[PDB]
Amino acid sequence: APKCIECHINIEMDPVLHDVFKLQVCKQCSKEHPEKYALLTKTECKEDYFLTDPELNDEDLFHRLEKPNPHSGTFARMQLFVRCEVEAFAFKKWGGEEGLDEEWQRREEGKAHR
Amino acid sequence: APKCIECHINIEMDPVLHDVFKLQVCKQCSKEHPEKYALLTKTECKEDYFLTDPELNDEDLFHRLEKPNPHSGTFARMQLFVRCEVEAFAFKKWGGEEGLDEEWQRREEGKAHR
DNA sequence: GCTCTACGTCATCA
């Protein structure tokens, strides 16, 4: 009777988190902890975490869910990533939340003087 | 008995020009007219004619000969292109020889000031 | 006189 790792109560896991992201997390807990379980588009991963296309395109590094592009079925598929994996990678790359914020400040300056 | 299109005499065609570039040209005529038949590396194509990697990577646009990279067999293969095909594409792209030199003149400032 | 592309950005088009 395997239980959700957040609540330890539910036995029915969120189908995407479980099947695509290998996380034994129920839907309710996923909505309760978006800090860990929210899905981010490829574009949002680049904005929020400063990850690059080669990193996000690496099939071996992140699990990901693809959907039809909401703008047209003929455009490139939308790619969804789970915040806990992307963040963990980004913390490693930039040095914790501190390093990430520092990079953000640096980026903000290049924005100001341009 | 088919003849070289430059001399109208030789029947033995240069093996590369014939087999890879589909040009019925003898080796001797090829050295007598480098303006048309000299082989240019991918890097030289970019320097000389300002073609881009997507143009030069298009399997459908240019014939090409590949060789082992002379720096190391483990590096990416050297790619050779025949001057008459690359020049002809470039004259379309930039508008003849004189559009090409205009672009040459233009770029000479971008690195002169920089 | 060798080739690939990320770099740090972004528009555009898809």
Place this chain on the structure above:
DNA sequence: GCTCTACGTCATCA
């Protein structure tokens, strides 16, 4: 709050 890549550069690393 969509994605891919050309931008023209070029330095590295292959």
